[PDB]
Design a protein around this ligand. Structure first.
Ligand SMILES: COc1cc2cc(OC)c1OCCCCCCOC(=O)[C@@H]1CCCCN1C(=O)[C@H]2C1CCCCC1
Length: 128
């Protein structure tokens, strides 16, 4: 599956280099500029738990997911991950619990010490 491929070939984009966030670019973006902290960011995504028991896509809500990058409004893996993306890029991220919902989880939606997988498309990003 795609998460296997990420565990196998994916780049470790953490600072501590602890493999808590692994990344593959699946479709290359355009431009050279990757969003700065504070930028308003527009994405589509598809997410799932490694346990295979919960899925979630922005498309289900029928609109872009929108957030301010680096302002803690998403899990840390997204702040780190999306900051590496270009306009038009699609990436896969595999995420250990320390960069997602930790040992507490977010019950019952995200269980304790869960690993997450996302496919993310970066649509646009604007200066605040
Ligand atoms: C759309 O609903 C949710 C989707 C996720 C997590 C949630 O809260 C814990 C959700 O509930 C309320 C929305 C909160 C959005 C902020 C918290 O979620 C997040 O930071 C990450 C990254 C942005 C997309 C949503 N997200 C999620 O973790 C989803 C998960 C949904 C359950 C499967 C794994 C993904």
């Amino acid at each position: 599956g795609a998460p296997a491929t990420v565990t196998e070939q994916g780049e470790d984009i953490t600072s501590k280099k602890d493999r808590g966030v692994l990344k593959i670019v699946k479709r290359v973006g355009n431009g050279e500029e990757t969003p700065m902290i504070g930028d308003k960011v527009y994405v589509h995504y598809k997410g799932k738990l490694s346990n295979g028991k919960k899925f979630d896509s922005s498309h289900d809500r029928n609109e872009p997911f929108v957030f301010s990058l680096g302002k803690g409004q998403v899990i840390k893996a997204w702040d780190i991950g999306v900051a590496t993306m270009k306009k038009g890029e699609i990436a896969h991220l595999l995420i250990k619990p320390e960069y997602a919902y930790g040992s507490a989880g977010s019950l019952p939606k995200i269980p304790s010490n869960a690993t997450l997988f996302f496919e993310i498309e970066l649509l646009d990003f604007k200066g605040e």
